[model samples]
Target: GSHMCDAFVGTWKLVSSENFDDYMKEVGVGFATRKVAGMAKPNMIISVNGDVITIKSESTFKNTEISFILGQEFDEVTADDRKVKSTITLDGGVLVHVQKWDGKSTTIKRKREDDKLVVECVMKGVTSTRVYERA
Candidate 1:
């Protein structure tokens, strides 16, 4: 049997960003850099071709792209170009991205909880979370 990630295709619009500045700050981004990125719209684009998945984060200020196979472990660059130990998993119907760097850990969970796509940002020792709506 084979499975395609067609369900994850399409472009997402940035409805809101939470801790975006703080997240970048923690990643060593300067105030000026944060300001430039903060003022632009950012969204993550996910595409699947067979078993390989391409994830692209684009904005008016900056852009990033990466590709990997499903159920595989890999290294990814954070917003500040910091190396992040990353892995992804699918639980039930939700896509989970677990990232670790230094002593800090973060998990990004995206799922169609209701009628709209819900993205939750969870970080260690941080109670603040951000939610973005699908466009």
Candidate 2:
């Protein structure tokens, strides 16, 4: 039988990004960068090897790579290139991660929605959603 984390071990391509620019602006990203980001749909590859989990976000803008273990906090850079302390953990059927930057915090959740992947971002009283499909 596959483990609980197996749900995330796959390649997903961004199909829809809702309010992504607003979410980045809430976290202090620049306007020019947000414009570029809003136009680019990135591909994410998630894999688990032994005790480590890796998530790679690939796009024309940049390739954001993260490696961490569950229940552990590590320094990571956001897709907008902000450095912060982030921790990801699994809760039931959902994967949750929180990032702290400049005393502001944002939380992201990833879960399976029917045949696609749904992600929600909450920050600064704003919530954004993104949907991904298998690549």
Candidate 3:
């Protein structure tokens, strides 16, 4: 929390995506789920209070919410329905999440750019980027 997220709050609507198929499937997301994820207009809401940060991914198909303190580990189920051990941190104004899914690793970085939110996902050797505009 730490007053580091004033520019990162509120709702952000998905604008574009790149290389999501490889990133999603790399984590074993099934066809139906992938299809729904592809079609849904996802909104990411970030709220920070005290030392806790909550990130919510909301859409028509599935909604996922994760709350964690900085420099702490927690259990989380991803929007794609993968259960993993997760830890979230903030560095240089970028929100970072590290996850372990069945001994595999994935890294997610979120940062705000003016009126846009940029999220980068890295899983195995595949990577994906999603850009969202303030809604």
Candidate 4:
């Protein structure tokens, strides 16, 4: 964790959601699950390191901040399904996060554009992007 996150500090709101249906379906989740997920607030947090990142995805309601290193094993008690694992890496400029729980694996990518951190669930093709405005 780094940066103190002072430059990117403030309350962020869910501005828009895209390709949510496809993403949920790709995760082997039914309509019920997708519907359930859409109702929650998706907040993005970051701990940067010399322009890089360390801590990511801090969801207040979900009670989880699924974070991982570029080439190390980081633990996460995923807020969605309670799955736990440690298989995270960095692909290009995106944070390659692959959570391995039991035998199932889920992939998620994190990227920062403008003042928003785009969280893309690679496995499901679902993106929960957060844009923060100073309040």
Highest lDDT among the candidates is held by which one? 2
Q: What local distance difference test score does each model get? A: 0.71, 0.89, 0.88, 0.56
- Report the lDDT tens digits of candidate 1 across residue range 46-105: 778777788787888878887877579899986556798888888887778888888877
Error of 2 at 105 (Å): 0.3
Minimal lDDT window, size 10, model 2: 1-10
Superposition error at 132 for model 1 (Å) = 5.0
Each model's total of backbone clashes: 0, 0, 0, 0
Which residue pairs clash within candidate 1?
none
Tell me the tens digit of each residue's lDDT in model 3 across 1-135.
Answer: 247677888889999999998888998889988888888889999888877788898999889999899889999988877889998888999989999977899999999887889999998789999999988
Candidate number with the higher TM-score (1 or 3)? 3
Give me the runs in candidate 1 sitting further than 4 Å from their true place.
Answer: 1-4, 23-29, 127-135
List, residue by residue over 11-93, the lDDT tens digit for candidate 4: 45566666766666766666776676766665555554454444544444464554344576766665556557666655665
- The candidate scoring highest on TM-score is 2
Instruction: Summarize candidate 2's per-residue lDDT along 80-134 as a digit string, tens digits.
Output: 7889999999998898999998899999999987878899999979889999999
TM-score of each prediction: 0.77, 0.95, 0.94, 0.63
Lowest summed lDDT window (length 10), candidate 3: 1-10
Query: Cα miss at 131, model 4 (Å)?
Result: 6.3
